[PDB]
């Protein structure tokens, strides 16, 4: 089983 | 003391590798950046430093990251002007124009080339199963260069006169590259890649990542293959 | 009734980065940047579920993206040193001659830097002793811990030394066999 | 010396469980410095700004249809999901609790006798001690240091009773603990 991350949301540069 | 040499159990087999050998030729074949005379502009992480280097060729990056062993190393390097040379990769490369990433190939450019553009030769004897099959000489513009320029140029030779790597597999079950250097010390690099189905770019690499460099005037390199049966 | 966090950060102008996952208070895991692997926090969690560490590693980056945005958002505004509370205790029942582990406990404190040294004696000791990453917090401050296992004796006397910019002078929480 | 400024970037997910999985609540949430700046709250959908410097960023991402949906639907994808492949060695991990009973080294006013509960390396944190006075609980004078997670997945805790000793007595310790399915017990003999 593998544990799943949730992804970084960028900012606006 | 030096790096003792491997025994066949030390050694990963392609017969025990089911992915695609073509991602390890890809790091090999006409694969690598170069960049002379250059200082590091930033720096993602405390052990590596990025530098602007643009793809001459096909324009696929401007801002490559190098990654080594230990800050100490980053540190010696960072406000230095110096030559880059190393085998890039872009899966899972990451750090904050496109980006490529890489391990080691650092070295001081400052009095460390010849005068006139003479390029140094270096032998590199090949064996397959234990007998010397053909020998020949790689080239650097560098007194003390990095062993993985050295590395990456003998096997981009190997693949075009030896199929070293394939699409999928290669002719022979194991290979490492071992390097002797004037003063009796040597070590290599297992030339294949870990069991299992997939080849992890980035992990192989990270090999490189001592930027051991070696003197090319007197530096010596041997290439040791086995076939499966013989 | 359970809270699991992905707690992840980027700090300047060390170039600190973490990526890690709690269970009640617990870490399960964090990546290592270096060697790009996951590390269980009790090995036997690795035999049961995988992490790609990968997936930490583009997290990062965009955390550190984000961390420039918003240095420069704020009008470089520095954070404000938080010091730690300090503890030390054993993590049983001390008896002598009896195997047992100091716990220093570091705790509310900010940011995430923090130099951390046993003293068996006024001396050094580097035998033994372990540390986790640090620990998220509901209020945004850290937590970490340090261990240091060994024999009780009323000969022995332990310091654990703690070093923060919000501590004006080093930090040292002494530990002895009261008896 | 090192005197520069430190600028700190901290990003939480947060899955909270009620009901094993019946109930779920995802809280996403950015912090500066010190301060949270903005946050994704599945009980309200859509990223909300909690303090000036995060209004930038709830308007841009709230902007993101891809973003929005993905957020949408992690209490499932995620929350749900990382709970299912970590269960067994979380939410069912469990280590008995080591119980013993002695006095205090203390022993403050006189005529008494401050007795010490210690009940460590047990997990999970959840646990009930109880002090007894011949087969009755005991609601006064009981003193505890509270839970102390060790971080390294157990706990202790001390639990005391102030006692006015009476040779013949029975003081006893109850700890109950998911780890065992019948409540623990230590006596001291006064």
Same mark, same amino acid.
């Given at each position: 089983?593998?544990?799943?991350?949730?992804?970084?949301?960028?900012?606006?540069? | 003391?030096?790096?003792?040499?491997?025994?066949?159990?030390?050694?990963?087999?392609?017969?025990?590798?089911?992915?695609?050998?073509?991602?390890?030729?890809?790091?090999?074949?006409?694969?690598?950046?170069?960049?002379?005379?250059?200082?590091?502009?930033?720096?993602?992480?405390?052990?590596?430093?990025?530098?602007?280097?643009?793809?001459?060729?096909?324009?696929?990056?401007?801002?490559?990251?190098?990654?080594?062993?230990?800050?100490?190393?980053?540190?010696?390097?960072?406000?230095?002007?110096?030559?880059?040379?190393?085998?890039?990769?872009?899966?899972?490369?990451?750090?904050?124009?496109?980006?490529?990433?890489?391990?080691?190939?650092?070295?001081?450019?400052?009095?460390?080339?010849?005068?006139?553009?003479?390029?140094?030769?270096?032998?590199?004897?090949?064996?397959?199963?234990?007998?010397?099959?053909?020998?020949?000489?790689?080239?650097?513009?560098?007194?003390?260069?990095?062993?993985?320029?050295?590395?990456?140029?003998?096997?981009?030779?190997?693949?075009?006169?030896?199929?070293?790597?394939?699409?999928?597999?290669?002719?022979?079950?194991?290979?490492?590259?071992?390097?002797?250097?004037?003063?009796?010390?040597?070590?290599?690099?297992?030339?294949?890649?870990?069991?299992?189905?997939?080849?992890?770019?980035?992990?192989?690499?990270?090999?490189?990542?001592?930027?051991?460099?070696?003197?090319?005037?007197?530096?010596?390199?041997?290439?040791?293959?086995?076939?499966?049966?013989? | 009734?359970?809270? *699991? *966090?992905?707690?992840?950060?980027?700090?300047?102008?060390?170039?600190?980065?973490?990526?890690?996952?709690?269970?009640?208070?617990?870490?399960?895991?964090?990546?290592?940047?270096?060697?790009?692997?996951?590390?269980?926090?009790?090995?036997?969690?690795?035999?049961?579920?995988?992490?790609?560490?990968?997936?930490?590693?583009?997290?990062?980056?965009?955390?550190?993206?984000?961390?420039?945005?918003?240095?420069?958002?704020?009008?470089?505004?520095?954070?404000?040193?938080?010091?730690?509370?300090?503890?030390?205790?054993?993590?049983?029942?001390?008896?002598?001659?009896?195997?047992?582990?100091?716990?220093?406990? *570091?705790?509310?404190?900010?940011?995430?830097?923090?130099?951390?040294?046993?003293?068996?004696?006024?001396?050094?000791?580097?035998?033994?002793?372990?540390?986790?990453?640090?620990?998220?917090?509901?209020?945004?401050?850290?937590?970490?811990?340090?261990?240091?296992?060994?024999?009780?004796?009323?000969?022995?006397?332990?310091?654990?030394?703690?070093?923060?910019?919000?501590?004006?002078?080093?930090?040292?929480?002494?530990?002895?066999?009261?008896? | 010396?090192?005197?520069?400024?430190?600028?700190?970037?901290?990003?939480?997910?947060?899955?909270?469980?009620?009901?094993?999985?019946?109930?779920?609540?995802?809280?996403?949430?950015?912090?500066?410095?010190?301060?949270?700046?903005?946050?994704?709250?599945?009980?309200?959908?859509?990223?909300? =700004?909690?303090?000036?410097?995060?209004?930038?960023? =709830?308007?841009?991402?709230?902007?993101?249809?891809?973003?929005?949906?993905?957020?949408?639907?992690?209490?499932?994808?995620?929350?749900?999901?990382?709970?299912?492949?970590?269960?067994?060695?979380?939410?069912?991990?469990?280590?008995?609790?080591?119980?013993?009973?002695?006095?205090?080294?203390?022993?403050?006013?006189?005529?008494?006798?401050?007795?010490?509960?210690?009940?460590?390396?047990?997990?999970?944190?959840?646990?009930?001690?109880?002090?007894?006075?011949?087969?009755?609980?005991?609601?006064?004078?009981?003193?505890?240091?509270?839970?102390?997670?060790?971080?390294?997945?157990?706990?202790?805790?001390?639990?005391?009773?102030?006692?006015?000793?009476?040779?013949?007595?029975?003081?006893?310790?109850?700890?109950?603990?998911?780890?065992?399915?019948?409540?623990?017990?230590?006596?001291?003999? =006064?």
């Amino acid at each position: 089983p593998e544990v799943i991350p949730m992804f970084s949301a960028l900012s606006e540069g | 003391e030096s790096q003792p040499d491997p025994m066949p159990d030390d050694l990963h087999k392609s017969s025990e590798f089911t992915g695609t050998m073509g991602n390890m030729k890809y790091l090999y074949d006409d694969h690598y950046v170069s960049a002379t005379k250059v200082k590091s502009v930033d720096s993602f992480f405390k052990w590596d430093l990025i530098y602007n280097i643009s793809d001459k060729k096909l324009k696929n990056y401007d801002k490559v990251k190098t990654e080594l062993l230990n800050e100490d190393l980053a540190k010696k390097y960072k406000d230095e002007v110096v030559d880059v040379y190393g085998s890039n990769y872009y899966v899972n490369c990451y750090f904050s124009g496109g980006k490529t990433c890489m391990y080691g190939g650092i070295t001081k450019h400052e009095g460390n080339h010849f005068d006139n553009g003479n390029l140094q030769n270096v032998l590199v004897r090949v064996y397959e199963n234990k007998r010397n099959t053909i020998s020949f000489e790689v080239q650097t513009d560098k007194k003390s260069v990095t062993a993985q320029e050295l590395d990456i140029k003998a096997r981009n030779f190997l693949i075009n006169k030896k199929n070293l790597y394939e699409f999928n597999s290669s002719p022979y079950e194991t290979g490492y590259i071992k390097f002797i250097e004037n003063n009796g010390n040597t070590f290599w690099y297992d030339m294949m890649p870990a069991p299992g189905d997939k080849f992890d770019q980035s992990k192989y690499l990270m090999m490189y990542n001592d930027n051991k460099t070696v003197d090319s005037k007197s530096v010596k390199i041997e290439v040791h293959l086995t076939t499966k049966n013989g | 009734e359970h809270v *699991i *966090i992905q707690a992840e950060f980027y700090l300047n102008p060390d170039q600190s980065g973490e990526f890690m996952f709690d269970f009640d208070g617990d870490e399960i895991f964090h990546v290592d940047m270096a060697k790009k692997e996951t590390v269980w926090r009790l090995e036997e969690f690795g035999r049961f579920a995988s992490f790609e560490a990968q997936g930490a590693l583009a997290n990062i980056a965009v955390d550190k993206a984000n961390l420039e945005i918003m240095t420069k958002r704020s009008n470089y505004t520095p954070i404000t040193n938080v010091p730690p509370e300090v503890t030390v205790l054993t993590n049983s029942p001390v008896e002598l001659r009896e195997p047992n582990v100091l716990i220093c406990f *570091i705790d509310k404190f900010t940011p995430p830097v923090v130099n951390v040294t046993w003293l068996r004696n006024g001396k050094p000791v580097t035998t033994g002793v372990s540390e986790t990453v640090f620990l998220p917090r509901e209020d945004h401050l850290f937590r970490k811990f340090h261990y240091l296992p060994f024999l009780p004796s009323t000969e022995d006397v332990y310091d654990c030394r703690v070093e923060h910019w919000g501590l004006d002078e080093p930090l040292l929480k002494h530990w002895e066999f009261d008896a | 010396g090192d005197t520069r400024p430190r600028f700190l970037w901290q990003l939480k997910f947060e899955c909270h469980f009620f009901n094993g999985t019946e109930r779920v609540r995802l809280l996403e949430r950015c912090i500066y410095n010190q301060e949270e700046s903005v946050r994704f709250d599945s009980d309200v959908g859509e990223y909300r =700004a909690v303090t000036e410097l995060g209004r930038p960023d =709830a308007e841009y991402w709230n902007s993101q249809k891809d973003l929005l949906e993905q957020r949408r639907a992690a209490v499932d994808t995620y929350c749900r999901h990382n709970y299912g492949v970590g269960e067994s060695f979380t939410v069912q991990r469990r280590v008995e609790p080591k119980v013993t009973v002695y006095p205090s080294k203390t022993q403050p006013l006189q005529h008494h006798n401050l007795l010490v509960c210690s009940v460590s390396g047990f997990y999970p944190g959840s646990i009930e001690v109880r002090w007894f006075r011949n087969g009755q609980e005991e609601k006064a004078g009981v003193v505890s240091t509270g839970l102390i997670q060790n971080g390294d997945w157990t706990f202790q805790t001390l639990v005391m009773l102030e006692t006015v000793p009476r040779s013949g007595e029975v003081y006893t310790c109850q700890v109950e603990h998911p780890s065992v399915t019948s409540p623990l017990t230590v006596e001291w003999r =006064a």
